[PDB]
Amino acid sequence: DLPVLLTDLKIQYTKIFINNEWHDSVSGKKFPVFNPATEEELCQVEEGDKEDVDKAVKAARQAFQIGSPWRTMDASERGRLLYKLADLIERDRLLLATMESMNGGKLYSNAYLSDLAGCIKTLRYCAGWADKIQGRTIPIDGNFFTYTRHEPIGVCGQIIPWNFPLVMLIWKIGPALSCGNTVVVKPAEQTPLTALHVASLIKEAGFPPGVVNIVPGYGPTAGAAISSHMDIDKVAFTGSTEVGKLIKEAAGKSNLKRVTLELGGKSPCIVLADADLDNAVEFAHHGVFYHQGQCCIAASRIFVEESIYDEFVRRSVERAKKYILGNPLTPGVTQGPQIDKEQYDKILDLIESGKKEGAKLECGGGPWGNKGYFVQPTVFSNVTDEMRIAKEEIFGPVQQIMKFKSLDDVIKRANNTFYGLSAGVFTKDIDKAITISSALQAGTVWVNCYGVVSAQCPFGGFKMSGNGRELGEYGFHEYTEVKTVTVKISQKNS
Amino acid sequence: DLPVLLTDLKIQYTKIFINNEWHDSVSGKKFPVFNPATEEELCQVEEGDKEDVDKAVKAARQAFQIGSPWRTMDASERGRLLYKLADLIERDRLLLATMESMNGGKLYSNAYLSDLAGCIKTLRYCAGWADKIQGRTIPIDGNFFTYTRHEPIGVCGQIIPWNFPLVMLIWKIGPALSCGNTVVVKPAEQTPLTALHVASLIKEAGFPPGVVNIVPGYGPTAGAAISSHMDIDKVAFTGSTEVGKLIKEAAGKSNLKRVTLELGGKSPCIVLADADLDNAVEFAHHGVFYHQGQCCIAASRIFVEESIYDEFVRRSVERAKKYILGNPLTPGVTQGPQIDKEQYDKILDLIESGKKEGAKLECGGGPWGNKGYFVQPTVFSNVTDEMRIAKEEIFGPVQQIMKFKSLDDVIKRANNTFYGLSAGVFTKDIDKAITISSALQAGTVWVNCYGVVSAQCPFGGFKMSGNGRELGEYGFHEYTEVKTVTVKISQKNS
Amino acid sequence: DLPVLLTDLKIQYTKIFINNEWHDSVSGKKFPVFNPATEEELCQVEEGDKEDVDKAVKAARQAFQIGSPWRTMDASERGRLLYKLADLIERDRLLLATMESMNGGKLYSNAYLSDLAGCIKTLRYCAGWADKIQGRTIPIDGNFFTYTRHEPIGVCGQIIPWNFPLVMLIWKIGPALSCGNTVVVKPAEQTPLTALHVASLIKEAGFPPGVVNIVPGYGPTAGAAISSHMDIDKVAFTGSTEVGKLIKEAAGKSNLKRVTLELGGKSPCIVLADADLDNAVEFAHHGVFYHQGQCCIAASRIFVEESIYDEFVRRSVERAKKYILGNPLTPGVTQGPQIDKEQYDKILDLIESGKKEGAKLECGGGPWGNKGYFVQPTVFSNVTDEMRIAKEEIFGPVQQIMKFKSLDDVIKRANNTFYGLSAGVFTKDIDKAITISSALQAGTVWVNCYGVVSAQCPFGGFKMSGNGRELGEYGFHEYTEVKTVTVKISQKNS
Amino acid sequence: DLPVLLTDLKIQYTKIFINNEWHDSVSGKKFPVFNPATEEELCQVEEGDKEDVDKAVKAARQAFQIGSPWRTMDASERGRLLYKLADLIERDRLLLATMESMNGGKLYSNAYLSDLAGCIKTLRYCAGWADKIQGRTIPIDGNFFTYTRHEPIGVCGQIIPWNFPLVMLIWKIGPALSCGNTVVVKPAEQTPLTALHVASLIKEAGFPPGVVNIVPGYGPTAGAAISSHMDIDKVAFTGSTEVGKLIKEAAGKSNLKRVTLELGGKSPCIVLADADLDNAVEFAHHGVFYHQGQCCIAASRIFVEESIYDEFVRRSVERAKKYILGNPLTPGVTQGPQIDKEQYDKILDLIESGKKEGAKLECGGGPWGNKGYFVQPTVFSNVTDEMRIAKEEIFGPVQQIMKFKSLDDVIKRANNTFYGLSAGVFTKDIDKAITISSALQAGTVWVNCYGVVSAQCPFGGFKMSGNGRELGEYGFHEYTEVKTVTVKISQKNS
C-alpha cells in the first residue's frame, strides 16, 4: 500500500539546530535549496560556516561533560530516546518521504516504502544496542584486577551525503547516540531539509540539548571546519573518494581525530554460465540503476561468461527500455532526475567517453526533458577495462556489460581497481559461491542477489572505498573509545 | 609417514593418580585390562571405587581453594602448562598410539595419524584460550559499576568413553583446565591405560597436585560415585544415552551439579540426485565404518534419492568389500575388532534383526576369526524406518541404506528420532545445502563431507544426543560459572 | 508519583490459553484463587492438568515447525512484537499492578513502581536482543567453510513462582521469545491471574498462535507434566531447591530435556568495621525484609565485625520496628501478608526454632491480625551457624544477625552452605571489596548495596541455588541451541 | 636469577630481509649504528630507501595472494609458527637481551628480565588468537543467509620505535601475523639490530617467504615510503605525535590506507591524601624514570593533595638520589644513557626551561660523564601548568611534582592536554577510584600502581596520544578487514 500526503507540503525548519533551539547563521547568510526535477528553488536555509560549527561543537562538548544528563542517564534510557525518535519519524512518514522525494529527486514510492522503512528499522536496531555495549574483565598477568570501559568517543562530526539523506543521517546518528556520543551533523548542501525536520523531532523526543546539533551549509566551508576542528574527536563521512582524502588529510593535520569513511565504488558482478539468468539480469539491472545510479554500491561493471553474454545483454537492454521519466512525486513514474548540475555534467561527459572510446551504445546516451537534471537510462556492451566508463564512478543511470571466459582472470579484473565497496556473484554452484566471494576484495559480497542492505549487517569498503564499518555489531565499535583500568590487588584468583 | 615403536611396549602406570602420586585402591582390589584383538589380558589396574573417588574429590577441592597455586597463577601460565603437556604427548606419540591401538582395538595408522594428531592439536587449541576467558563490564540501570567474572566452576567429574580414549580425555581436561577447574577423571574400564600415562605427563609438566586426578574403575561403581557426589560441582560424560539418563537423574538427586552429556546418535545423511556421487559414497562409507562403527556420529542412516539409489548401493557395497580384518598393530590391516563382548553381542543381535525384519543383506552379517571381537563389515539395503537397524544405535560396522523420492518427507524421516548428534547433506545446489542443513535437528551438519571434527568448532547433540557443547569458543562457556559484581557508586558516566 | 485505578478491578481472564484462544480444562475442573490479605476467594480459574499440557505442547510444537510464521519472520519482527507487548503492559500498568497486589499479597506501591517498571524494562531489553543473536564463522583446520547457527531450542516449558509473578513471567518469556522459542508457561497456582491478562495482551500484540501458551494449575500435576514431557525441549523453573531436584531428576528420566533452575538461597552479608554503617544497616534491612522476605536473594545471614555489631543490631532493630501491617492496597501500609498457609506455617515454625535453639529475639516473633497470613517483622541477634534459622531458607520477614572477628573465618562461614545465590559486602577498602567478592561462592555479589537487579546483568545461583543464568547477554545463551555447519570446499583462504 | 652471555657478542645480521633472504640495498649505501653509552659505532647496516620498500611490498603482496601458502594454511598453523618463533627468541634470550642492551642503551637486567620476558609472552599470547579470530552469522531482514569473514587486511607497514625495539616489534608482528597479514617492518634507525636477528629466526621457524620483510633505514626516507605507498593496505606506527600527524596525512594523500598510531603522552597521576604514601611514591617514581624516561606512558605530571605534598616530594627526591649511572651492561648500574644526540639535546633544553620558568630544582638538572648521552635524574617540585616541563613530553629522566587541593580542578588539569595515553590514581576509597578513573581522558588508567602492561589488555591513546588499540582481544580487530557475505535463499528459518 502506498498512501500520500493529503494537503501540500510546507517547509517549516530552515535554521541551524544547536542546544535544541533554532539559530540564524553568524554571518546572517542563507543559501537556496532546489528541486532537481524542476530546477526551481524550494526555500532558503541558514548557511552554516566555521563560526557556526564552533557554536555547535562547544554545545556538543558541554553535553558530553562528565556529570551531564547525557553521560549520566542509563544506557537503557539512551535506547528509549532512540526508539521514541523512530516512533516520531514513523508518525511523520508521509511528510518526510514527500520532502525527501521533493528535495532529493527521489521516487516517492521508493522514498516512502524503502528509505523511510529502513530509516525507522535502523533506528530501532540501534536503540536495542544502547545498553548492550559492554567492556571486559581480563585475566592479566600479575596480582591485578583489570577491566575495560567501552566509552563513547565524544564529539563526533558527521557529514551526510545527498543520495540518501534520511537513511544516511540515521546510519550516522543512530550508532553514535546509542554509544553515548554527541554529534555535530552537516547534511548535504543539496538536501538539508529532511535532517532539519529530524532535528525538530529530536527536540520533541526529549534528547538533552547539545546531544544533536545540525549545521546545514556547504562542504568546503562547514565540512572543512568539521574535518579540521581541534575539539572534534571523530569525523564520519560518506561521499566521493576525492573528498574522503581531504577529510583524512585534514584530521592528521589538525588533532589526529578518528576517521571513518564510506566512499565510492566501481563494484563488479561476476555472472557464471550456470546462473539463474533472469534473476542475475534483474538484480544486476537494479544493482546499477537504483535511485538514478546514485548509489555508492552501483553494480557498474557486470562481467558475464561468454556463452550467456549475448542473451544477458539483450535481456538487460529490454529491461532498461521500460522506464518512465518525470517528476518523482507523480505515480507511475519509474525514474527521477539526477541531483544537480555538477553530477549531471559529470555523467554526460562519461557517457560521451564510452561512445568515443568505442563501447557499443545499446540504448540511451543523452539527456531528457525541458526541465530537470534527467539522463536517459544508458546501457553499454562490449566495454573493456581501460575505458573511462569501466574505471570511473559514473553515479548515473549507466550500465557497463563485459564478457569473460576465464574465472581466474575475471576475478583479477574485478579486483583490479582502487575501489572495493561491494560485489555480486551469480552461480548455482556451492564451491564457486564460497571461493569467489572469498577472493573478491569487496566489503559486501552478494550471492545471487544485489543491493541487500540491513541494519544487522556491517557495511563498508575495502581499499579506497572506505575505512571502517557501519551498522551491525561490528560498526558500533567505531563509536566507542576503549579504556583499560588496571587495579593493584593483594592476591587475584581465577 | 608412519613410524613405529622400535622395541615392544611395556606397561608402567597402573595405579590411581591423586595429588600427583600413585595410589593403590582403598580396597586393594585390581581389575584386568584386555586386548580386544586377542582377548588376552594385558595387565591389572587398581580398581577405583566410591572410597577412592572421595580421596580424589578432596584433593581436587583443596587444589581449587582460594589462594591455592592453581587459583592464583596467571591464566597465561595455565595456558603454558597445557602447551607443555601437548609437547610431552607429542614426545610420547609412538608409545601412546601403540598403547591406544593395543588396549582400544584401534588401527595403529589411525591412532598415530588421527587420534594423536587431534589430541595434541586440541590441547594446543585449549591452551590458547586460558588467558582469553573474559567477563564483561555492563551498563546497568542506576548508579552502579557492574562487572562479571567468568570463574572456573570448581571440581569437575569427567567420565571418558572407550572408543577414543586419548582424544576424549583431552576434550574433557583441555577446556576444564584452561578455564581453571580441577578434575576427577574416570577413564573407561576397557581403556584406562593411555589416561594413566597422560597422568604421568601431567606430573612431569608441573601441574599443581590435585589439579588432575585419574581414578580408573567400573561405571556403576566409580562413575556412579562421581555422578552422585555432594562436593563435585559438575559432571561431563560421553557414552550411551541410557547411562546419560542415569547421570542426569543422580545429579538432580544429589547436589544439583551441572551436567553436560555427549551421547549416542542415529545420524542421517541425505544424498540428493545432483550430488557428486562417489564423494557422497566415500564420505557416507567412512561416515558409518570409521573405527569399526564405534563413533557416536556414525552415519547410520543413508537416505538416497531414488534415481541414484541403485548406483549408490552398488558402489557402497564394493567399497565395503575391500577390508582386511586383523590385529590393528599389523600394517596393511584396515579393520580391527569391536571393543568387548557386551558390544560384540549387541551388534550381532542387531545384524540378525535386519535379516529377520527383511532388510536386504548386501555383504557381511556374521563374525570373523578364531580370536578377537571381529564383525564382518555389513551393508543392508532397502532398510525401512521401523526396523531395529534404523532405530537403534548399532555402534558396529553395519551400514543402512534407504531410498526417498520426496525432500519434505526425507527431512521428516531424518528428524524422526530421539537422537540428533549430527547429519550429512550431499548436493551441488546452494539453496538446498542451506535450507536442508537449517531444517535438520542435528548439532553438526556436514555438507558434501562427513566426520570433519576440529578443535575450533563446537560439537554436541540436539535432543537425546546430548546437553551442551564441547570445544570451540562456545564449549568453554560450560566450564565457567558466571559471577555478577555490582558496586554502588556516587555517580556513573557512560 | 503513585496513581491508582479509578474504578474497582474486575477479573476477566480465567481460562487456559492455547493457540491464542481461551480453553476450558479437559476435565472441566476449576480451582480457587485467594487474596492472602483477607483469605477470601477472588475467583475460580480453569485447572490445567497433564491432558491440557499436552494440547499446549502440540500447539507450541506446531508454531515451531520449519516454515511457520514464527520461524520465518525476521528476528527484528520478533523484537518488534516484544516491544509492542511492553507498550501494552505499560498501557495496563494500573490494572496489572492492582491485580498483582491483590492476588500476590504485594504492596501496591512496590507493585506499581518496581515490579511493573522492571517487567516493562526487561521486556524492552529482551526485544533489543532478538536480531543481535549471532553465530560464528570459524577458521577450522582443513579445506572447509564452517559456520554456526544459534538456533532457538524449541518448545520451552516455563514454571513461574508466586513471589514475583509478572516479573518472573517476563524473565522467562522475554529471552525465550527473543531467541525464537515457543513456550508453555505454568504460572503459580497461587498467582495465575496476571499471567492470564498478559496472555490476552500477547494475542492483542499479534504473536502467532501457539508461540505462547499459558496453562494455570498445580505444581505436582501440570508442573510435573511439563518436567516429564517427551516433546518439551527445555524446562526453566524458579522456586524451592526441593522442587528443583524433582525437575532435574524427571528431565533425566524422560527425554534429557535442557534444564535451568533458579532456586532458593541463604545469602550472606559481610559487614566490615570500616563500612558506612547506616548504608549497611539500610541495605541489609531491605535485603532481608523486601516483599515480606519472599525473595530468593533474602539477605538472611548478616555477619557484622565485633566492634560495630552492637550498634548494627540496635540500628537494625529500630528500622524493623517502623512497619505498618495490613491490606497491601491501602496507602501508607508498609508490609503485606505472606502468600499462603503452607508458607505462613513454615515461617512461624522456624521462628520458634530460633527461640528454642537460643537466638536473642529482638522484636517480632509471632503472627498479626484477625485475617491474612501476616507475620510480625522479626529480628534475631546472637545467631549461630548450626541454628535452623541460619541454615534453612525462611522466606519470611525474619532477619538473622551474627558477629565475627576474623575475615578468613567469616568467608568460610558465608560459603559454608549448599546455597549460593547472592551475597553482600560492605566496606570502604578497595582491596577488601575485590578480594572478598572474588572469594564468595555466590552468583551475584553486591558491594555497598543489596538487591540491585537489572535486565543488563546475568542472574543465577552457584551450587544448589541454581543451574545457568537469566538475563544479560549471558542468559540468552541458554535459550539457543548451537548448530555447526561444515561445508567441504576446494580451497579455503584466511 | 640473572645469567649472562659467556662470550662477547658478535653482530651477524645487517642486511635487508625480503622473501627470507638477505639483500644489499638498491643504492648500495650503508649507515652506522651506535652504542649510546660509549658513542662508538657498533656496525654498519644496509640503508633501506623507497626503492627497497618497493621490493619488500611486492614480496608481501605476493605472499598475500589468494591461494598462497600463508592464505591457505590452517589458522592453527599460523598459531604454531608464532609459538615456534617465541621458542626461538627464548633460546636466543641472552644474545637478544645483550644486543638490545648494547644497541638501545637499555639496562641489561631490565632487557633480560622484562623486555625479553614480555616479548616471548606477548608472542605466545598472539599465537593463541590465530584460530580464534571469528566472524558472525547474522539474522538479517528478508530471505537471506548472511555471514561475515574477518579477513586479514593485507600488506601492513609497521614502523617500530627505538625505546623498546624487541617488544614493539612483537606488538606489531604478533597480532598482524596471527590474523593472516603480511608485513613490511621498518625498525628504528637507532635500533635495527635486534629486529634483524628476529628476521633470521622467522626464517628458521619456517614462515613462508614474503610474510615478514624487514627494511632498516631512516624515518624520512623508508618510513615515508611506507606511509605513502599505493599498495600498502595499513600502516601502524609508534613514536612522536609530530611524526604521527605526517603518517596520517600521507595515508590520506596516497591510497587512504588504514592507520593506527601509538604516540606520546603527558600522563598524569592524581595522588589523594588517603593513599598508601610510599606505594604511590614508588610507583610514580618508576612511572616517570623507567628506561631513562623513554616511555610513551611516562608519569610526567604527578598531582599530590596539599596535606601530603611535602612528604611526597621529599620521599620522591630521596628515591631519585639512589641511582648509579653507567654502561647498561655492567652489573649494579641502575641508569643507562639516552638514545642519541637529538633526544639528549631536547631533554637538556627542557630541563633549562624548568629552571628559567621557575620550577624548584630538587636534584639533578645537568649532564653526566665523559662519554654517553647521560642526563642526571632530575626532580622538579612546585611545577605549574603553563610551564614547558608540564606541557611537553620530555622523554627523559625528569620528574614533575604539582600540588592540588580540589579534586574537581585537578581532574580538569589532568585532562587539560592534547595527550591522553595513560594516567594513575592513588587512593584507598572505592568510590574515588571508580569515579576518577572514569573521568580521566586516558586510554589506560592504573589504580594504586603504574606501568602495568600485559598482553591480555588493550593499550592505546585517547586524543593525540593515538588512534586504535594494540593487544588484548580488542587490538586484534584492527588487523582484520570485515567482509559481509549475503546469500539469497528461498526461505530462512531462525
Ligand SMILES: C[C@@H](Sc1nc2c(cnn2C)c(=O)n1-c1ccccc1)c1cccc(O)c1
Ligand atoms: C580424531 C578426531 S575426532 C573424530 N574423527 C572421526 C570420527 C569418525 N570419523 N572421523 C575421521 C569421530 O567420531 N570423531 C570423534 C571422536 C570423539 C568424539 C566426537 C567425534 C579429531 C580431530 C581434530 C581434533 C580432535 O580432538 C579430534
Ligand SMILES: C[C@@H](Sc1nc2c(cnn2C)c(=O)n1-c1ccccc1)c1cccc(O)c1
Ligand atoms: C523487580 C526487580 S527484581 C528484584 N528486586 C528486589 C528483590 C529484593 N529487593 N528488590 C528491590 C528481588 O528479590 N528481586 C528479584 C525478583 C525475582 C528474581 C530475582 C530477584 C527488577 C528490576 C529490574 C528488572 C527486573 O526484571 C526486575
Ligand SMILES: [Cl-]
Ligand atoms: Cl562481524
Ligand SMILES: [Cl-]
Ligand atoms: Cl558458536
Ligand SMILES: [Cl-]
Ligand atoms: Cl557475562
Ligand SMILES: [Cl-]
Ligand atoms: Cl576490551
Ligand SMILES: [Yb+3]
Ligand atoms: Yb537545461
Ligand SMILES: [Yb+3]
Ligand atoms: Yb569366541
Ligand SMILES: [Yb+3]
Ligand atoms: Yb486464622
Ligand SMILES: [Yb+3]
Ligand atoms: Yb660530549
